Each structure stands twice: as structure tokens, then as C-alpha cells.
Amino acid sequence: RSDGLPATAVAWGTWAGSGMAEGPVADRFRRHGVIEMPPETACRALQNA
Amino acid sequence: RSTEVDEVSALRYRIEWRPTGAGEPARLDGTWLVAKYAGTADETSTAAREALESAGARVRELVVDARCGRDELAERLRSVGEVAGVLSLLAVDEAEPEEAPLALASLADTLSLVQAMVSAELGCPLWTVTESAVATGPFERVRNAAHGALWGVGRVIALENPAVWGGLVDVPAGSVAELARHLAAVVSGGAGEDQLALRADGVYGRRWVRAAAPATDDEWKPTGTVLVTGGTGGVGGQIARWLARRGAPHLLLVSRSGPDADGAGELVAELEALGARTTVAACDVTDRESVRELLGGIGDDVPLSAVFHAAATLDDGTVDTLTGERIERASRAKVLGARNLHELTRELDLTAFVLFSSFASAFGAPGLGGYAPGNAYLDGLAQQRRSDGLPATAVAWGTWAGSGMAEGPVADRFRRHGVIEMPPETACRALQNALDRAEVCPIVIDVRWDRFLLAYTAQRPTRLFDEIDDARR
Amino acid sequence: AEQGYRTFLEVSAHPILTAAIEEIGDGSGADLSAIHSLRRGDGSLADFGEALSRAFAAGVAVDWESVHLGTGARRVPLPTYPFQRERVWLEP
Amino acid sequence: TPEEFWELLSEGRDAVAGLPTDRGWDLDSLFHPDPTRSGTAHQRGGGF
């Protein structure tokens, strides 16, 4: 962002069964932490980002 | 042997009644009203009162009739004066009106009474005494599943008016000794239980406890025809899709909209592609004779063993307008439909009668107070069916990823202070595992304790969640 | 206090220098137990019975078959030990 | 205590109340409509 190339470092939450922490780590925050964010609204979140 | 069902193990949960404390007995003051009916003389009133004036206060009777008005009890409580609490003995030894499970007079009186204390500016905790409305475990038995609806609405009420709501106090059916033994400490208890189940072996509090999933080898198959009530709806829709994927021979998606549903044809085509010989029908489920002739029209070529009740109507669940008949005509498609299906399937060898309920009963839910009682009636019905020779499974689902049956404003609110859409690709496996155990009342939720209990145990501290190990966080 | 013994009985009609050996225990090793028989203007058998109480409570192993050698005393059913129970369960 | 047990025999009280919940018993695989299902019990209580 400081230089002349736009960038967007979106942090993400696991979605359905295709998340980035999908597995024991996902299953654990799925009990005490980040939620399964629907793709239908995550795409719009990235769009407005 | 399993890694993917670790997600399911943390999905499925059960409600277990652990023995809590009977409460710290404190000498009460002012008055404690024994609100009830007046048709029959009740020894319950005397048994409760003998430890009520002995608790320091005085006992005043508050007769309430069916839909007497949302105000009458308010000016009655203002006339008696300042009150430290009310014992709702209006749900004692009362039979279910066969017209409708939610038309139970005790539910309507409790809702009217609650709003009466709200409009009366009284600010006293309310206790509702029930007779085995919730079994203390599968060892015990529910006498009336309709009474368990009062329990569900009470769990919801705790999240609206913390000062007005005290909780519910369950006692054994017929016996009044537990009242005299415990009520004085229970109502004044500094412990904080909002769910009490007094029994001969002690006092039990409602607890959230993990459900273990060792992946039992027993496998449930959809063999036979599947009666998916409200099949067009997403709650029934994804269930039907999973049934077809698993190899369900017949499907009988039934709803009032039926072929006239927005998405009926596409869903039917998907089911025919995944499975075979699927059928959609526009048939009412509230009427007993409608379901009777529907099962009579079920072809004799296949027996019925997979009645999957999913239909549920819902507009609002706010307590300020919540009356018994409002819940009745809001969730009749749930309660009367499930009652008709159970009454029609006593004589049928069902391998599955999964009643599709929600977390509206599992725990408190603002905006679902008119929805919770239906889910609770389903839970009580399953608890009763498992005691007899009919398998039952009252899964309390979370918000459905794709449905709109319970996906409303409250769904997105709870998405931002709690649970969200459970993935169908793992909710189906959770249901499969629940049918592998013949689990009586699974609670398959995607609960995020850390952020969810920040809006639950906040207004009303509880021990309902004091049994989950991760619920301390 | 160095001789393995930690308690002392100030046998006297009044315990002069009572806290002095308590002062000894306060500033050296462990605090000692100051048991005394009587007190100034206190010579009743109730005081000596109270002297026996503070002796037992301070660790002195009083022979209780000698206090009750004969007094017309018989055994009486009494409540047992109140076991302070805590949940210790092992799950499979 | 043995004196509280006489308060159970003299007044004719039955100690059969229900299955324990302290022990972490499953209680959900313990009862099924099928009486021959492995893992299920037949008694719906007992003095525990």
C-alpha cells in the first residue's frame, strides 16, 4: 500500500468444510473461537474490502 | 479409527440433569404468591405454602384463567403490594388439551403472568412448578411433552427479564413431598439454577454436557419410505438430499405448499438424480385425518419407517406479545403435526422418527420464544417415545446453512452473538451418528462458547453451561 | 524445642511468663504451645477441665481413659467423622 | 448410617429412585426399544 501496488491482506474464517485451518484446529475454534463464515457473505465482504 | 467424525463429536450434544445444590435457604420477606387455577382443590398449594410462610413471607393466592388478559395479574400484584416472587402452581397435574399441544392453558397463563409482572413494575423472580415436565434422565419418564414447552419458553424468558424470571422447579408427578422439602431453599437459593428438577433422590439442574462419538459400528439406513414433513423447506430439504445420497428408496416430502413451493421442482429433480422414486405432496399436517389418509395413501408396496418431521412456521418470538394461542397457531405445524404422526405411527415399525427441533429450546433465544415451545414439545415427545417401543431422535439443530425455516433476524443476531449455519456436509453426518446411537435428544450445534456465553451468562449467570469443559472459557 | 519436643505445660496456679516461651518459638524454629493449668483468680475444676481442653487442642496426648477412669460414664452413639467429600471420578 | 437406615425400613420407603448421573454414565445408549441391542440396560432405575 505504501508503494504503487494495491494490496488487501484479508484475514479469513474457516468456511463449511473447505476452510484454511480445516481439521482439529478448525474443530476446536469451532467450539471456542472463529465461526464458519458463509461464502455468500464472505464474497461480499471481500468485494467491499 | 476416525478423524472426520471428530467434528461430529463436537457437534452433537446432550442435555443431562446433574444433581445440583438445593439452593441456600434465605428468610424471605414481603409475600410469595401461589399463582394457580381454582377449578380443583389442590394439596399442592398447601404443601408449597407450608414452607412459604415459614420462609418469612406470606402466601397469597392468584387465580388465573385461560387468557384472562395480559393485565389482570398486573393490577392484582399491584394491589397485594411488593412481592419477592411468585410460585406458578398453574401447571400442576394438568392434562394436555387434545386440541393442540401449545394450546396448553398453563403456557398461556405463564406468558400472561410474565408480561403481567413486566407491566406491573414489580421486579420479582417467577418460579413455575411443573410435575415431571422434563424427565431427570432416560431412566425417568415425561408425563406430558406439552408441559416441556413451558420449560422451553422459560429458558427463553430468562434472557428477556432477568429480574422477573426466576426459573422452573420440576417435581415428581403426584407427589408433593419434594415441594415441602426443597421449595423454600430453591426459590431463595443463591446458587442461581434457572432449571430445577426435584426428585426423591435429590435435586437436579439442567446441564450442557459433551456427547462422545466413538463411531459406533451400527449403521442406520433409510430403507423404506421417508415421510419428510415440510420437505420443500431447507431444514427438510437438505435432509431429503442427504437421504437420497445415502440411498433412501422412497421419499415422501410433504408440506402444505408442496408442488406450489419456490424450489419444489428443482429439489425433486435433485432427489430423483441422487435417489429414486421420490414424491412431493401438498397435504396439511395439522389435521389428524389428513395425515391418517396420507399414510393410508402411502403405497402398501413399501412400509413407512423414516418419518422425518421438519415443518415449522415462525413469524416472531418476542415475549411482549407471546400468548399461548399465539404460540399455538405459530407452531401448530410442528406440535400438532408431530402429535398426529406419533399417534398414527404407534402401530408402525419405524426405524427412525427424527423430530427436527432447534436450539431455541436447548438454551434461551430472544425472538424464538414462540418457536422454543414447539422444539421443546418435540424433545419431550422423543423422550417419551424412547421409553416405549418406538425409536426417536430430537435433534436440536442450529441455524441451517441454506434454509429459511428458522433463518430469520434472530438467526443473524445469534450469528453475531453465538451460533451460525452448521455445514450440511457435516450436519448430515451428525444426524447419521445420532441415529447410529439411537440418541434420544441430540443437540447438534456449532456453538462458539467463548463469544456465545458473553451474551448468555452475562444478564443471567447459570450452571446450565457449567458442565462443558471448554465453557469455562 | 531442639529436643524433639514442641509443647510445654506451665504447671502453676497462674502461668507467669506465658508468652515468653511463645516469644521463644516466635523468633526461633516453630511456634511452641503454651498450656497452663490455672490462672490468677481461676482455680475451679472448670478451669482445670478447661486446662485439659487447651492441652488436647495444643497437641498434648491426654490419656482419656484416666480422665474418665471412673465417673459413671458409658458409651453413647455419636455421629461419625464428617468426611469432607469432593468429586473424584475416573471416566473410561 | 445404621440409624438413618432404620428411618428407611420403619416407614416403608423404597430406595429405588433412578440411575446415577454423577458417574458420567452415557444414559442414552443404555435404553433402546430393542431389548437385545448390545450396550442397553433393561431396568429404568434402581437404588443407587
Side-chain angles (χ1 to χ4, degrees):
Chain A
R1 184 58 173 121
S2 47
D3 57 65
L5 312 171
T8 302
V10 289
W12 273 128
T14 36
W15 33 31
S18 53
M20 67 281 145
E22 216 40 70
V25 211
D27 127 273
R28 281 297 93 198
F29 264 49
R30 190 178 293 122
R31 263 65 241 190
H32 35 87
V34 170
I35 220 162
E36 309 304 305
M37 184 177 177
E40 192 277 323
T41 179
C43 68
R44 319 190 278 113
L46 181 56
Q47 179 58 85
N48 62 71
Chain B
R1 324 201 205 214
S2 174
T3 315
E4 71 274 14
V5 194
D6 195 5
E7 173 172 3
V8 170
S9 71
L11 268 166
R12 192 185 65 192
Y13 289 134
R14 70 154 62 88
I15 287 298
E16 190 170 2
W17 292 96
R18 302 295 177 95
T20 184
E24 285 78 14
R27 266 299 168 282
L28 305 162
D29 66 306
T31 183
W32 279 73
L33 272 75
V34 64
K36 63 185 296 296
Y37 63 91
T40 79
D42 288 330
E43 69 276 15
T44 78
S45 165
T46 63
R49 79 179 40 233
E50 69 89 23
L52 274 188
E53 66 264 11
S54 177
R58 61 175 176 174
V59 187
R60 313 261 65 70
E61 297 83 342
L62 207 67
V63 60
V64 57
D65 52 279
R67 274 79 70 192
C68 72
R70 311 275 271 169
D71 55 352
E72 183 62 58
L73 310 173
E75 69 274 16
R76 293 182 76 181
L77 291 151
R78 293 181 278 226
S79 296
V80 63
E82 190 42 62
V83 185
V86 168
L87 282 81
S88 292
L89 260 61
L90 55 85
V92 302
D93 60 23
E94 184 178 1
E96 179 181 357
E98 306 297 84
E99 161 68 55
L102 289 182
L104 191 60
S106 47
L107 179 79
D109 297 324
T110 308
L111 285 167
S112 175
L113 217 135
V114 162
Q115 281 311 289
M117 242 130 15
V118 167
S119 86
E121 292 89 7
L122 190 60
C124 64
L126 164 67
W127 302 96
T128 312
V129 170
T130 45
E131 279 74 359
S132 63
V134 268
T136 12
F139 48 93
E140 236 87 280
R141 221 251 176 198
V142 192
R143 66 169 182 85
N144 210 346
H147 267 71
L150 273 90
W151 272 86
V153 89
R155 308 166 174 112
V156 184
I157 287 166
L159 279 73
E160 311 310 315
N161 44 7
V164 177
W165 189 240
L168 304 103
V169 184
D170 195 356
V171 304
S175 166
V176 291
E178 286 83 8
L179 304 162
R181 289 185 81 155
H182 298 264
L183 281 183
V186 164
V187 299
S188 63
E193 322 294 301
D194 290 332
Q195 288 102 0
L196 277 297
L198 317 187
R199 298 293 187 269
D201 53 356
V203 298
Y204 293 85
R206 199 171 181 265
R207 301 280 205 274
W208 209 277
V209 63
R210 299 242 170 211
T216 298
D217 59 349
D218 194 3
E219 280 298 323
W220 174 89
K221 297 286 102 176
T223 59
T225 181
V226 188
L227 196 149
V228 186
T229 318
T232 56
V235 169
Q238 275 98 29
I239 291 301
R241 298 211 198 93
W242 174 67
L243 285 147
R245 289 176 247 150
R246 282 292 175 272
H250 294 89
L251 281 80
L252 283 179
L253 282 72
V254 166
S255 67
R256 279 88 65 194
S257 179
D260 292 330
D262 314 297
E266 296 83 1
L267 182 58
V268 164
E270 290 176 351
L271 297 175
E272 189 72 27
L274 302 159
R277 53 199 196 184
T278 65
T279 313
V280 74
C283 188
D284 191 43
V285 69
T286 313
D287 184 28
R288 180 187 178 90
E289 271 290 348
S290 86
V291 191
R292 164 77 266 181
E293 285 189 354
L294 181 73
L295 188 153
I298 293 177
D300 292 10
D301 52 355
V302 62
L304 174 62
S305 301
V307 176
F308 276 40
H309 190 115
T313 55
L314 177 61
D315 47 308
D316 214 2
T318 178
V319 192
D320 60 355
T321 300
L322 264 188
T323 178
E325 76 272 23
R326 173 201 208 206
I327 314 215
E328 183 262 337
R329 88 288 184 275
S331 286
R332 51 98 165 171
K334 283 196 290 176
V335 286
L336 282 86
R339 208 196 60 222
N340 296 343
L341 281 160
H342 167 68
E343 287 159 320
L344 184 62
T345 51
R346 276 90 57 86
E347 296 83 4
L348 274 78
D349 184 72
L350 311 190
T351 180
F353 188 71
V354 188
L355 299 92
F356 292 134
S357 82
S358 88
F359 52 89
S361 164
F363 54 85
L368 291 173
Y371 183 57
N375 309 122
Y377 182 73
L378 305 176
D379 294 331
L381 214 62
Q383 292 166 356
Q384 292 189 359
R385 295 183 82 258
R386 231 246 14 221
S387 47
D388 59 67
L390 294 174
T393 301
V395 287
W397 292 126
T399 53
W400 277 65
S403 194
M405 201 215 67
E407 183 81 18
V410 303
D412 59 70
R413 292 149 179 172
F414 292 15
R415 132 204 277 107
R416 78 161 305 158
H417 64 87
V419 298
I420 204 168
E421 342 278 288
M422 65 182 179
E425 49 85 20
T426 185
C428 68
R429 322 192 278 113
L431 184 56
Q432 181 59 265
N433 189 179
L435 281 159
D436 290 348
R437 307 289 166 80
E439 273 295 305
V440 58
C441 289
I443 317 297
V444 180
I445 313 293
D446 265 341
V447 39
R448 299 321 205 256
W449 279 288
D450 63 325
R451 319 126 21 154
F452 158 69
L453 285 190
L454 248 34
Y456 196 88
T457 76
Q459 15 97 18
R460 283 214 91 170
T462 192
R463 292 180 179 91
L464 175 50
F465 282 91
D466 286 26
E467 270 309 314
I468 299 293
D469 182 66
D470 295 336
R472 325 273 47 82
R473 281 82 66 193
Chain C
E2 262 82 275
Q3 214 85 342
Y5 306 133
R6 302 289 184 87
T7 184
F8 56 98
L9 267 61
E10 278 179 313
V11 296
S12 55
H14 160 84
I16 300 91
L17 277 296
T18 309
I21 306 93
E22 293 280 348
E23 272 183 358
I24 280 285
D26 286 341
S28 178
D31 295 3
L32 302 176
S33 306
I35 302 98
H36 57 92
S37 314
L38 296 184
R39 183 61 167 79
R40 179 173 322 120
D42 289 289
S44 182
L45 185 57
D47 204 48
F48 208 83
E50 194 268 330
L52 297 170
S53 58
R54 65 162 61 89
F56 172 73
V60 177
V62 186
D63 279 16
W64 297 115
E65 291 270 10
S66 303
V67 190
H68 316 108
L69 77 166
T71 174
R74 281 84 65 192
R75 282 192 182 96
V76 174
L78 289 184
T80 44
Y81 184 94
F83 298 98
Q84 305 292 149
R85 298 170 183 271
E86 61 161 3
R87 182 181 186 278
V88 291
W89 201 250
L90 192 48
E91 314 204 1
Chain D
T1 45
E3 66 269 16
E4 202 176 347
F5 179 61
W6 193 244
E7 314 179 2
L8 183 74
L9 295 171
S10 87
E11 68 186 6
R13 287 203 307 101
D14 59 329
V16 170
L19 289 190
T21 51
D22 282 327
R23 309 176 139 81
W25 283 18
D26 182 76
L27 295 177
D28 284 333
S29 85
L30 269 65
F31 301 123
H32 186 254
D34 188 19
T36 66
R37 183 177 176 87
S38 287
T40 67
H42 279 157
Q43 87 171 16
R44 310 295 295 269
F48 281 81

